[PDB]
């Protein structure tokens, strides 16, 4: 079935490879920050942990390895580009799936990374035969278990425990201080709680971008290499355009195709269309970091098991903004409450500034938060933009509307979204006497009803004065700092 004489390996520039020191590795977010300036223009990068950093995989317990059942979905590789979704495949265990992968590669190739690459793209671009594989993707680790260890109180001290509390343990990365995802109380699946990816040969994850343009960290626990292709975030649009240009009929059929994660396009074609693509080979025991709005794709060289999770340093806050705004224009539903994260971050930073005002002891956390807030600070800039947006949106409301101050438990329990935008309304909501428990964003308050303003009101979580007070507090306004440290 293999045909190496017709291989179509795409000759693509390598994504940068980093070799963090133990020092660097003690501070995940800091290290990611230093990485930013060096690899953000590449979209993705490969991170090799310091020597002998190899956390034990609990999935290798044969109690889980041979018994824990997980679902798979069927991928027709020859259909990924030229031609729709993935259909329900048979249940597997890690043992079973590894055995079938061995069987598959034995049948298909009777095999190094570039051979598998050339053959894969051979199948995708040109289509001799139907090739059908399975992927156990997007498996909940809270259901299945994590590839990382957890703390067990009653048992002897072990390196496993140290790994369990390590920051690069993907169960711990999302809510590290410096990541605004910490301010989301719900253990959002995939975004905050890591997801598992069990692979076989040719197993694909098609072109896509993280939800809310978040950072993505992917650890390969065990098995064969995972090949990655990444696009820089600042070329995202370009990429998209090329898709529209090179798969016209598929986009005539599905204008929302990109968000469906079932379409693959070769890096060769992308290079010939002027889109910068960068290659990375993730081997067992290594990390792959995806930057905000960095389109990425790739496949598996054989049986493996990966674990991915989102992370959101302060620098992400400007992208995460655009995203939700974009979502509003796409009228697509979100995965998280952005304003909750922004406001949460601002509140924590204000708390730290308040502590410094009391000449409290400066901790590393306090330092990290102070460092990103002042009239030059990224957090300050983000909050400032959001507040400006708020004031313009309110300014554009015609006079009539009443104000009711939103009670704090307004987003707890229930996600509240603009009926038209699906814009998250954690900060502001508009309504009328026509529609209790039915709201719009400040931009679409107009479109909610036909009623006159007498009946129109707006739930506000914070008055405009209070918001501007927050911006001033980040810039050192002690009174404002006192104000927001109380909330």
């Amino acid at each position: 079935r293999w045909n190496p004489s017709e291989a179509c390996r795409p000759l693509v520039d390598d994504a940068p490879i980093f070799y963090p020191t133990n020092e660097d590795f003690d501070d995940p977010l800091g290290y990611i920050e230093k990485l930013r300036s060096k690899a953000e223009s590449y979209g993705i990068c490969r991170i090799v942990p310091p020597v002998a950093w190899r956390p034990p995989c609990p999935l290798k317990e044969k109690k889980i390895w041979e018994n824990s059942k997980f679902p798979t979905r069927i991928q027709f590789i020859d259909l990924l580009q030229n031609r729709f979704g993935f259909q329900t495949g048979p249940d597997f265990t890690l043992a079973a799936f590894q055995k079938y992968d061995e069987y598959f590669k034995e049948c298909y190739f009777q095999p190094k990374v570039k051979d598998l690459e050339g053959e894969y793209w051979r199948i995708v671009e040109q289509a001799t035969d139907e090739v059908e594989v399975y992927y156990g993707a997007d498996l909940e680790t809270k259901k299945f278990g994590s590839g990382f260890p957890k703390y067990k109180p009653g048992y002897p001290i072990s390196e496993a425990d140290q790994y369990s509390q390590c920051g690069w343990n993907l169960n711990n990365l999302s809510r590290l201080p410096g990541s605004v995802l910490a301010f989301e109380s719900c253990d959002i699946s995939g975004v905050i709680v890591p997801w598992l990816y069990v692979g076989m040969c040719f197993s694909t994850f098609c072109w896509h971008v993280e939800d809310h343009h978040l950072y993505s960290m992917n650890y390969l626990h065990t098995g064969d290499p995972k090949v990655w292709y990444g696009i820089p975030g600042n070329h995202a649009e370009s990429f998209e355009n090329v898709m529209k240009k090179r798969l016209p009929d598929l986009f005539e059929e599905q204008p929302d195709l990109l968000h469906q994660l079932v379409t693959q396009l070769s890096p060769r074609i992308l290079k010939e269309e002027g889109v910068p693509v960068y290659r990375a080979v993730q081997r067992s025991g290594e990390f792959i970091l995806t930057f905000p709005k960095a389109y990425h794709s790739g496949f598996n060289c054989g049986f493996n098991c990966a674990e991915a999770v989102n992370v959101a340093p302060v620098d992400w806050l400007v992208h995460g903004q655009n995203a939700v705004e974009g979502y509003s224009k796409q009228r697509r539903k979100s995965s998280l409450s952005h304003d909750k994260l922004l406001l949460g971050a601002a509140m924590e930073a204000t708390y730290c500034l308040w502590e410094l005002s009391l000449s409290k002891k400066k901790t590393p956390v306090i330092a990290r938060w102070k460092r990103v807030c002042s009239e030059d600070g990224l957090l300050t800039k983000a909050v400032k933009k959001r507040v400006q947006m708020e004031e313009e949106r309110l300014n554009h409301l015609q006079d009539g509307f009443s104000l009711r101050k939103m009670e704090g438990d307004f987003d707890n329990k229930r996600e509240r979204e603009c009926f038209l935008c699906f814009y998250d309304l954690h900060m502001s909501a508009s309504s009328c006497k026509c529609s209790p428990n039915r709201f719009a964003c400040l931009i679409h308050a107009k479109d909610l009803c036909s009623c006159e303003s007498k009946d129109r009101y707006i739930l506000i979580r914070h008055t405009l004065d209070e918001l501007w007070a927050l911006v001033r507090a980040l810039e050192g306004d002690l009174d404002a700092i006192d104000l927001w440290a109380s909330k």
Partner: peptide, 7 residues
């Protein structure tokens, strides 16, 4: 419920 995307 609250979730990441799936193909």
């Amino acid at each position: 419920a609250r979730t990441k995307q799936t193909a």
